[PDB]
Amino acid sequence: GTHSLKYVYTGVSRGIDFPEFTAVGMVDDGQFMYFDSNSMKAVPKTEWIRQNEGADYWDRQTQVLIGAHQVFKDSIQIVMERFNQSKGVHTWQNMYGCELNDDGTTQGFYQYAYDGEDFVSLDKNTLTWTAANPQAVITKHKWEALAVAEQNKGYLENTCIEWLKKYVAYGKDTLERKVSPQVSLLQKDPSSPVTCHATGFYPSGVTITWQKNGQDHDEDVDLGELLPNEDGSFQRMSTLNVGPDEWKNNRFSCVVEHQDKTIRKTEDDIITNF
């Protein structure tokens, strides 16, 4: 399957509720490690990574992330100055990572942002940094003179893929798991709109379609957002908003498609608290 390794760094100059610098690591967008400037320690967040990497791994990861905190602390005082902002709460964000498909092909990105808006981002096809404003052009010129793209690209294509492959091995049972949705048709009261609810699934790709008389029907449909549950799984719902007289004169069904599986619900399935 397709698997990814990503790191997201949240740095904050003048906040209160959170550490100055937070680092989260994810395989398939699921946390497997954490680090922050309060603990100054990088710790495990999944069993497969703790069973499979000893004290030496967590030591050198903490070292690297204390380097990341310092570089952030300096980095944010400059971008404030370039933007003429000597007062306030400001954020510095960094996210990079890997992708490995079935092809054997690979993809990667390396991106920074200031106050929640694109600052610089790597194009490792051309070994150049895309600046999003004048204030970033100063960094583009500096890093391109310094071979930062050379290092970052070596990381994304080799080092991060090597670590990714070990991680899909360590976590092969969880990471390759395929869990079906539990699907229900919901109704608050006999005239209410009707809701197709799908929950408990992984991976996150789901399709929810409504049907009128056996054919797909995209009128009066409100597809809800992809939301997470408390385990690695996700949920999503869709709502058909038609008057139950159109319910009489037609046969509406919900169809949920996930992985190699398909589930179907009709008016006979409607559950309710009423």
């Binding site: 790191y7 680092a23 690591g25 380097g67 570089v71 980095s75 400059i78 890093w143 670590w163």
Partner: peptide, 9 residues
């Protein structure tokens, strides 16, 4: 495993 934060902006 995380990469070096190599150079400040």
């Amino acid at each position: 495993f995380a990469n070096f934060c190599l150079m400040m902006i």
